[PDB]
Amino acid sequence: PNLSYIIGKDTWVEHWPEEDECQDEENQKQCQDLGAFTESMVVFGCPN
Amino acid sequence: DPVLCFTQYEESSGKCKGLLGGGVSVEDCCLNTAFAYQKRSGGLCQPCRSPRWSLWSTWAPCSVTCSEGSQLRYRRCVGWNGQCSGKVAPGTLEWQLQACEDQQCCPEM
Amino acid sequence: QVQLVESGGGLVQAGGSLRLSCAASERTFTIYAMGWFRQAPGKEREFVAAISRSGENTDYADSVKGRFTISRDNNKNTISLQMNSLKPEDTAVYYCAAGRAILVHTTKKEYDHWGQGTQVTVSS
Amino acid sequence: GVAGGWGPWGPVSPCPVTCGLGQTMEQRTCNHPVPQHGGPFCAGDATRTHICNTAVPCPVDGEWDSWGEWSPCIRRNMKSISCQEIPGQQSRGRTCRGRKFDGHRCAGQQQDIRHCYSIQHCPLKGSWSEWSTWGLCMPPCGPNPTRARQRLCTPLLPKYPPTVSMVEGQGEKNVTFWGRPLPRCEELQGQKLVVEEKRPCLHVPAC
Ligand SMILES: *[C@@H]1O[C@H](CO)[C@@H](O[C@@H]2O[C@H](CO)[C@@H](O[C@@H]3O[C@H](CO)[C@@H](O)[C@H](O[C@H]4O[C@H](CO)[C@@H](O)[C@H](O)[C@@H]4O)[C@@H]3O)[C@H](O)[C@H]2NC(C)=O)[C@H](O)[C@H]1NC(C)=O
Ligand SMILES: *[C@@H]1O[C@@H](C)[C@@H](O)[C@@H](O[C@@H]2O[C@H](CO)[C@@H](O)[C@H](O)[C@H]2O)[C@@H]1O
Ligand SMILES: *[C@@H]1O[C@@H](C)[C@@H](O)[C@@H](O[C@@H]2O[C@H](CO)[C@@H](O)[C@H](O)[C@H]2O)[C@@H]1O
Ligand SMILES: *[C@H]1O[C@H](CO)[C@@H](O)[C@H](O)[C@@H]1O
Ligand SMILES: *[C@H]1O[C@H](CO)[C@@H](O)[C@H](O)[C@@H]1O
Ligand SMILES: *[C@H]1O[C@H](CO)[C@@H](O)[C@H](O)[C@@H]1O
Ligand SMILES: *[C@H]1O[C@H](CO)[C@@H](O)[C@H](O)[C@@H]1O
Ligand SMILES: *[C@H]1O[C@H](CO)[C@@H](O)[C@H](O)[C@@H]1O
Ligand SMILES: [Mg+2]
């Protein structure tokens, strides 16, 4: 049951800014991208 | 331009309460946004906050005591260094006109 | 920033008197408007008396008005609460409060700096 | 009867605020010559409440803007989902506006997402509503104000399931219709979409 994940050349890493950090106008374009990404995978999953 | 500077803007009454002093400029008194200013002391108590629309006043009395009339109420864009929603300069009023009816009895005498 | 030390409490009989004093930091004394609070056994914190930074404008609660008289000493960095006609309902821990006021004539009811307190017990 | 004069234009109290403007005081208290026994009093002006000026602006907390307009209701890799039983998603945006000088940030979520059906430009069956409440006098303070009430052709929304399941969890979510449809109805007084009636306002006052 112990498990180690590998950050190799086939691993995507992206920074998630916190709740009060999304109030900047520079991160306003990015935080609306990350929020809609979760509900399309939680409620609908992957098509095809 | 020197303007009387107050220490507290009483909201919903439009009254400048708590006097701090006079003769200070408008740029210096509004460094704290919880303050208020009053030019010429004849009225127009403006807060140091960003220009937002104030609350609508209560309705004016009905223009006739009989049958269908009309009544007004005003709203003043309060604030400084900015424009209200609709390219509106500060100090401009907006009115709304509604038809009223006080009673349905007429010439009682 | 500012620190408050209370003194003057004690066991007074019913009908007697007691005078409290509050020593604050000297370098930041006249900045804060100050007042008096209390906390009885089994109740919330209760506003007692307040005084402005001038000492001219005073404010009191309705339960202590007439009997209590708040005074400000702007030279010895102390305030005083002259408590006359002590009743058994005045048994509480009196806290000295310090809070920033912009005008010199404004009394406050909300304060951000508080002290350790002093014990006042009135018996019958 | 001790004659009282004035002391110093006294020692300064420190400026009681780290931002903007404040009020120090010194006055001139009648302390170096005190009137005693109730004789004469100190003559002049004892008033000094001084405006101290700190050259640092104070923090201002940002306020929320109004909610924006709802985005078009689509679904990924599902062509157009209009007039079908395909649940999609839509978004809405706000703007934290006004935070300057190390003020507090806006408390809350800046995006609002709900599940939707696309009813944009879909023909539907309809029914005529009753007479609405009489509107305001437009234009106010201008030449000839008139009231306006109307009966509009309200569409009959189709009986779709009001909830949808999620893939990851068993808990269900709300579905809410969005769009501007084209309602079909019989005519009333020569109109197909909306019939109104205008009545002028009486006793218009000066503004
Ligand atoms: C999806 O949207 C719907 C609205 O279209 C939303 O329904 C909400 O339901 C709650 C609970 O029923 C409503 O709250 C009510 O408020 C009124 C007063 O305004 C009360 O009288 C109600 O109490 C009665 O109803 C309860 C059951 O309905 C009983 O348990 C209770 O004992 C009383 O009989 C009730 O508190 C609310 O007004 C609506 N509408 C909203 C929130 O807009 C539903 O919750 C939404 N779903 C999700 C997941 O968001
Ligand atoms: C308000 O009260 C009414 C009961 C009337 O006494 C009004 O007087 C006048 O009545 C005539 C009707 O003959 C109306 O045209 C007007 O409302 C008014 O001038 C009174 O103003
Ligand atoms: C001095 O430094 C400033 C940067 C602020 O942090 C000041 O705090 C202010 O304290 C008053 C209370 O008297 C509040 O009204 C202000 O909201 C707050 O900014 C600090 O004193
Ligand atoms: C005036 O209009 C309404 C009151 O009916 C509110 O949206 C608000 O109070 C505004 O000031
Ligand atoms: C105006 O309309 C009525 C009074 O006629 C009330 O609901 C309220 O005072 C409003 O301002
Ligand atoms: C958006 O949400 C509601 C209106 O639907 C209000 O709480 C407010 O106007 C906010 O901007
Ligand atoms: C989105 O939701 C409705 C339209 O269905 C309206 O309240 C408004 O246009 C909002 O932006
Ligand atoms: C409105 O139009 C006519 C009345 O003229 C009816 O067919 C029906 O009531 C519709 O809703
Ligand atoms: Mg597949």
Keywords:
part of a larger assembly, 4 chains, A: 48 residues, mainly alpha, 0% strand, extended, B: 109 residues, mainly beta, four-stranded antiparallel beta sheet, three-stranded antiparallel beta sheet, 7 strands, 33% strand, elongated, binds a molecule of 4 linked components (NAG-NAG-BMA-MAN), binds a molecule of 2 linked components (FUC-BGC), binds alpha-D-mannopyranose, binds magnesium ion, immune system, complement, cascade, proconvertase
Roughly what percent helix of chain C?
under 10%
| Rough outline of chain C | globular
Number of helices of chain B: 1
Number of domains of chain C: 1
Largest interface: B-D, 27 and 29 residues
Mind summarizing the main beta sheet of chain B? 4 strands, antiparallel
Helix-strand topology string of chain C: EEEEEEEEEEE
Terminal Cα separation of chain B, in Å? 58 Å
Strand content of chain C: over 45%
The order of strands across the largest sheet of chain B is 2-1-3-4
The CATH H-level superfamily of chain C is Immunoglobulins
Helical segment count of chain C? 0
* Percentage of residues in strands of chain B: 25-35%
In whole angstroms, how far apart are the ends of chain C?
Answer: 40 Å
Total strand segments of chain B = 7
Bound molecules: a molecule of 4 linked components (NAG-NAG-BMA-MAN), a molecule of 2 linked components (FUC-BGC), alpha-D-mannopyranose, magnesium ion
Q: What would CATH call the architecture of chain C?
A: Sandwich
Pattern of helices and strands of chain B: EEHEEEEE
Q: Globular, elongated, flat, extended or rod-shaped: what is the shape of chain B?
A: elongated
Radius of gyration of chain C: 14 Å
Helix content of chain B: under 10%
Organism (chain A): Homo sapiens
Protein name (chain A): Complement C3c alpha' chain fragment 2
Disulfide bonds (chain A): 22-31
Site (Coordinates Mg(2+) for interaction with Complement factor B Bb fragment (CFB)) (chain A): 48
Describe the structure.
The structure is cut from a larger assembly and holds chains A (48 residues), B (109 residues), C (124 residues) and D (207 residues). Chain A is an all-alpha fold. In chain A, 31% of the residues lie in helices and 0% in strands. Chain A is extended and about 40 Å long. The N and C termini of chain A lie far apart (32 Å). Chain B contains one helix and seven strands. Chain D is built from no helices and twelve strands. Chains in contact: A-D, B-C, B-D, C-D. The interface between B and D is medium-sized, with 27 and 29 residues. Residues 64-66, 106-108 of chain B line the site of a molecule of 2 linked components (FUC-BGC). One alpha-D-mannopyranose (MAN) is lined by residues 55-56 of chain B. Chain B: Disulfide bonds join 5-29, 16-45, 30-48, 62-100, 66-106, 77-84. Chain B: It comes from Homo sapiens (Human). Chain B: It is found in: Secreted. Chain B: Glycans are attached at residues 56, 59, 65.
